[PDB]
Structures are given as structure tokens and as C-alpha cells.
Amino acid sequence: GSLTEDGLSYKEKFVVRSYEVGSNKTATVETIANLLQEVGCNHAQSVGFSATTTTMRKLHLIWVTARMHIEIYKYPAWGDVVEIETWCQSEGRIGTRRDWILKDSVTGEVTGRATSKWVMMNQDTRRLQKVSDDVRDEYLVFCPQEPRLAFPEENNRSLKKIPKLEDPAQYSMIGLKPRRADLDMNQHVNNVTYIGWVLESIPQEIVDTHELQVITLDYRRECQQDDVVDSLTTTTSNDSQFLHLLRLSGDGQEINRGTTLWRKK
Amino acid sequence: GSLTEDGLSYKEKFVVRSYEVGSNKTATVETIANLLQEVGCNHAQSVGFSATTTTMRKLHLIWVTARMHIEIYKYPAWGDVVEIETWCQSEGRIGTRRDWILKDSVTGEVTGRATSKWVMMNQDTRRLQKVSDDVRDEYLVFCPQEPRLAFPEENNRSLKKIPKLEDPAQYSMIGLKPRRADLDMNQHVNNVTYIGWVLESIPQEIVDTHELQVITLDYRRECQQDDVVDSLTTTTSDSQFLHLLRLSGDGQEINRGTTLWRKK
Numbered sequence: 001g002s003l004t005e006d007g008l009s010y011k012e013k014f015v016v017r018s019y020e021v022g023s024n025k026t027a028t029v030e031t032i033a034n035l036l037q038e039v040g041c042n043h044a045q046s047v048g049f050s051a052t053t054t055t056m057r058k059l060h061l062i063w064v065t066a067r068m069h070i071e072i073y074k075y076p077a078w079g080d081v082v083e084i085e086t087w088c089q090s091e092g093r094i095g096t097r098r099d100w101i102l103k104d105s106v107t108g109e110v111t112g113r114a115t116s117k118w119v120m121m122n123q124d125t126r127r128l129q130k131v132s133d134d135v136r137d138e139y140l141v142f143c144p145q146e147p148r149l150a151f152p153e154e155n156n157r158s159l160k161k162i163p164k165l166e167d168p169a170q171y172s173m174i175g176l177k178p179r180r181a182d183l184d185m186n187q188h189v190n191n192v193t194y195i196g197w198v199l200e201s202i203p204q205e206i207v208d209t210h211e212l213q214v215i216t217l218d219y220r221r222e223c224q225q226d227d228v229v230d231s232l233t234t235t236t237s238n239d240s241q242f243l244h245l246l247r248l249s250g251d252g253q254e255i256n257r258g259t260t261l262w263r264k265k
Numbered sequence: 266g267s268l269t270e271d272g273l274s275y276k277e278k279f280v281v282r283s284y285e286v287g288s289n290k291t292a293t294v295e296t297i298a299n300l301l302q303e304v305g306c307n308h309a310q311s312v313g314f315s316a317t318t319t320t321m322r323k324l325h326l327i328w329v330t331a332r333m334h335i336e337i338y339k340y341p342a343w344g345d346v347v348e349i350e351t352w353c354q355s356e357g358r359i360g361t362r363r364d365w366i367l368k369d370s371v372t373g374e375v376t377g378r379a380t381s382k383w384v385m386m387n388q389d390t391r392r393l394q395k396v397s398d399d400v401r402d403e404y405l406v407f408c409p410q411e412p413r414l415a416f417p418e419e420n421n422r423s424l425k426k427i428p429k430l431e432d433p434a435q436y437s438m439i440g441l442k443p444r445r446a447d448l449d450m451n452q453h454v455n456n457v458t459y460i461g462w463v464l465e466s467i468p469q470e471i472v473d474t475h476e477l478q479v480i481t482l483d484y485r486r487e488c489q490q491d492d493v494v495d496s497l498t499t500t501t502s503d504s505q506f507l508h509l510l511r512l513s514g515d516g517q518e519i520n521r522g523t524t525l526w527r528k529k
């Protein structure tokens with residue numbers, strides 16, 4: 001992996017592993033999400049972050065994901081080489097955006113794209129803050145100054161407000177709990193695990209006869225390593241669409257909402 | 266990744282990823298088991314295999330793991346490059362063995378090793394069956410002829426019989442269920458998932474104060490996509506543990522194991 005010529009983006013090649021594929025012998029959207037996270041981490045390391053600054057670490061401030069949007073046109077095959085380019089851009093005091101483009105190394109064709117909104121939060125209190133100038137100014141030398149959008153379309157499917165699924169749900173998967181392998185190095189549930197829990201309530205028949213094209217996930221609250229999750233899905237629709245909700249099995253506190261678009265194989 | 270000069274073993278390098286590390290910012294034993302699995306599939310691929318022969322495929326016969334034995338001396342750091350060498354060997358009609366050696370790619374020091382026993386099974390009936398001479402000659406030109414052992418020591422840790430934990434267990438984690446990310450390309454629960462379920466009944470303070478040195482796991486029966494698992498652990502002491510996985514309902518055995526932990 002390396003910063004591009006201009007130092008304002010990062011590129012990395014991945015060979016798809018045997019255990020990274022599903023029934024199609026192609027990469028799951030969870031392997032894709034993990035590769036996005038790895039290249040994002042390598043980009044931050046490459047310019048001397050860890051993705052907080054010294055100002056942020058001093059104030060116990062972190063970046064957390066508010067929205068993930070992924071679009072896949074073709075899932076890579078086991079042993080295929082995929083190339084991912086990633087960069088960040090300020091969206092003012094609200095937060096920052098990380099975008100990705102996925103390419104077939106052999107053809108150079110775009111096979112997917114992703115974008116993500118991040119907000120600043122106090123580690124301890126869990127309270128959001130707007131981004132100070134001094135923090136804004138720290139990152140600005142690592143980001144393009146002209147807009148560079150994975151989803152340029154002034155109004156695109158990555159920017160809808162997602163509605164709250166109403167009881168009763170059409171489909172559900174009850175009593176989901178994280179195991180150690182779902183935790184990151186700070187013992188929080190990995191952002192990708194929530195993607196997996198959302199998809200657990202899609203019926204096997206959809207998964208057997210459709211491919212996931214688009215997923216948008218909002219992150220409201222985190223599942224604590226000793227919480228239990230219920231996953232709820234309702235059909236909203238040759239294209240199939242679904243509304244998704246994750247909530248704590250007990251009190252019914254919302255942790256995520258989302259939408260998926262599937263096309264027939 | 267490439268077969269070695271003599272065509273009788275396979276080598277592959279891996280850069281340890283951000284999401285592959287635990288709270289020590291080193292590779293989990295599950296990330297290590299995944300890497301063993303990946304180099305193993307690449308070795309089978311490099312010499313023409315499915316790791317079944319066209320004869321086996323016609324008979325609806327597969328290889329299934331009876332036993333996994335892993336010993337780690339140092340877990341690789343995030344960003345570190347680890348080199349894994351792997352090879353197979355007949356143990357006659359009973360089954361075959363796959364061995365691995367893990368090296369630090371910078372120092373060339375051995376940081377771990379693993380061995381596994383594999384038995385032939387009819388995919389449909391799930392009946393064991395011993396290995397025929399036709400299905401043996403096919404594999405023997407891909408395997409060293411002189412014995413080559415990751416664990417050479419005549420009657421060593423990897424060859425003990427594992428006893429059945431007795432209720433009540435000291436510790437338990439119940440209601441464990443696989444998700445799609447736990448399945449392989451044939452929609453079976455991945456061999457590595459069971460290692461994760463065994464370790465789920467180890468208390469957090471052990472995991473926080475010890476590093477895992479040795480794990481031996483026997484594979485008795487599959488967890489189906491819609492089965493529920495209970496994980497049971499009892500201290501048998503360095504700290505040592507006996508392990509049992511069983512179906513939450515009828516309490517049918519799917520695995521047994523032991524783990525050895527060193528104080529950090």
C-alpha cells in the first residue's frame with residue numbers, strides 16, 4: 001500500500017482469501033467492509049495519525065462512524081486481486097467523509113465504491129462535538145481541497161434520511177451476541193459486525209437468488225460486549241429493497257437503521 | 266505464495282491486518298488459524314486439487330479435520346509480516362497429517378507451529394472409511410517420503426487423548442449460534458469458528474493476564490447453520506483448561522479441547 005504521487009490519497013492491493021468468500025466463491029460485503037477498514041487504517045498510519053491528532057488525544061476525542069454507504073457492481077473472486085483507493089474530505093464543523101473506489105487490478109474497471117460520514121465524540125462522556133478550527137487545520141494538509149466524491153451525483157442514494165421500521169417486522173433474527181473475534185483492539189464491537197447482524201434477518205432465499213448491490217447503515221449507539229441484539233427487516237419494494245433495524249433485545253433501544261438493494265442473479 | 270524448490274512444501278507471507286489483532290495489538294489465535302487455512306488451500310491449489318482428487322469427487326468423499334494442534338511462542342504485531350510453510354504426509358489408511366511452521370519474516374525465527382489429523386468421509390452418509398491405495402498413490406508424489414514433523418517429540422502434547430469434562434463445568438457461555446460470516450463457500454460452519462467458541466468460556470481476566478501458548482481441539486460432529494452451541498471450561502491446574510462444546514438442546518458433543526496459558 002502507498003500514498004499516490006500527490007500524497008492526497010492511498011492505494012492498496014488485496015488478494016481475496018479462501019475464507020473471505022461465500023456460496024458464489026466471491027467476496028462477502030463483510031470482507032469488502034474489512035478491506036475498506038484496513039486501507040483506511042493504513043492511510044492514517046502513512047501520515048502519522050492513530051485516526052486522531054495530538055490535540056484530539058489530549059482532549060480524549062475520537063472519530064466515530066455515523067453512516068456507511070457501499071455500492072458493489074462485481075464482487076471479486078477467491079484469488080482475484082482488488083485495488084482500493086481511499087481519501088478523506090472535511091464537511092466543515094459537522095464531521096469528515098472517507099471515500100473509497102474498488103478496481104479489478106487486471107482490467108482497471110471500477111467494481112465498487114463506498115463513502116462514510118464520521119463525527120467527533122468524547123471517548124468517555126460519549127457527547128458529540130463540532131470540529132474546532134485547530135483540528136480542521138491539522139487534517140486539511142492530508143485532504144484534497146477541490147471536492148473529490150465517490151458519489152458525485154448532487155442527489156444520490158448515499159444521502160437519503162432512513163425511516164424507522166414499524167412493528168411488526170416481516171423477518172427477524174433474535175438474540176445476536178458478539179464473541180471476542182467481533183471486538184477490535186480497544187475491545188469495542190467492530191463496525192463490520194453490525195453489517196453482518198443487519199444481513200442475518202434477510203431470508204436465505206433472497207441471499208441464494210440475489211446479489212447485494214447497495215447498503216446504507218446509520219450507527220446510533222454501540223452494542224456493549226455484554227448486550228444482545230435483535231435484527232429486523234421488512235421488504236419495501238426484479239430489484240428487491242429492505243428496511244433494516246438493529247435494537248437491544250431487552251429495552252428495544254435502537255443501535256442501527258439501514259436499507260439494502262438486491263438484484264436477481 | 267509458492268511451492269519450495271523441491272515441490273514438496275508451500276510458503277506464503279501475510280501482513281497482519283488492523284482488524285486481525287486483539288487487545289495486545291497482536292494476531293488472535295483465530296487470525297493465525299485462518300492463515301494456516303489459507304496457506305493450506307493455496308498449497309492444494311498449486312498442485313491441481315479441488316483438497317479432493319477426481320477419484321474422491323466421484324466417490325462423494327472429502328477430507329475432514331479430526332484434530333487441530335497449535336503452539337504459539339510469539340503472536341505477530343499488526344503490520345508485521347509472518348511466513349508460513351506447510352506440507353502433508355500419509356499416516357497410512359487412518360488419514361493424513363498437515364503441518365505448518367510460522368516464522369518472523371524479518372528474523373527468520375520460528376514463532377509458532379501447528380499439526381492437524383484429517384480423516385476421509387462420505388459427504389452425504391458422513392461415514393468415516395479408511396483410505397484406499399489408489400487414493401494414496403495420487404497424493405504421495407506431493408508429500409515428502411522421509412518423515413517431516415512440526416512436532417517430532419515421540420509421544421508429545423499433540424498426540425494425547427482428551428478427556429470428557431464432567432458437569433458441572435467451572436465456566437460456561439451458552440446460546441452460541443453461527444452467522445453467515447461463520448460459514449465457508451459450501452455453507453458449513455468454518456473449522457476456525459469452533460476455536461472461537463471454545464475460547465468464549467475462558468474468563469476475561471485470564472485473557473487479560475495470560476497469553477495462549479497451546480490449543481488442541483478434537484472435531485466430533487458439525488454444528489449445522491441452525492444448531493445452538495454451549496461452551497464449557499474447567500481449570501485443570503501456567504494455567505491449563507479442559508474444554509467441551511455441545512448442542513444447547515440434547516447436549517450432543519461437537520468438540521473437546523485443552524488450552525495452556527502463560528502469565529504475561
Ligand SMILES: Fc1ccc(-c2ccn[nH]2)nc1
Binds near residue numbers: 036037040041068192
Ligand atoms: F464498513 C466500514 C468501513 C470502514 C471502516 C473503518 C475505516 C477506518 N476505521 N473503520 N469501518 C467500517
Ligand SMILES: Fc1ccc(-c2ccn[nH]2)nc1
Binds near residue numbers: 041096098119
Ligand atoms: F473522518 C474519518 C475518516 C476516517 C477515519 C479513520 C479511522 C481509521 N482510519 N481512518 N477516521 C475519521
Ligand SMILES: Fc1ccc(-c2ccn[nH]2)nc1
Binds near residue numbers: 045047049063096118
Ligand atoms: F478525519 C480524518 C481522519 C483521517 C484522515 C486522514 C488519514 C490519512 N490522511 N487523512 N483525515 C481526516
Ligand SMILES: Fc1ccc(-c2ccn[nH]2)nc1
Binds near residue numbers: 333
Ligand atoms: F485451524 C485450522 C482450521 C482449518 C484448517 C484448514 C486447512 C485447510 N482447510 N482447513 N487449517 C487450520
Ligand SMILES: Fc1ccc(-c2ccn[nH]2)nc1
Binds near residue numbers: 306
Ligand atoms: F489431509 C489433508 C491435508 C490438507 C487438506 C486441505 C484441505 C484444504 N486444503 N488442504 N485436507 C486434508
Ligand SMILES: Fc1ccc(-c2ccn[nH]2)nc1
Binds near residue numbers: 308353
Ligand atoms: F490429504 C491430502 C490433502 C492435500 C494434500 C496436498 C496439497 C498439496 N500437496 N499435497 N496432500 C494430502
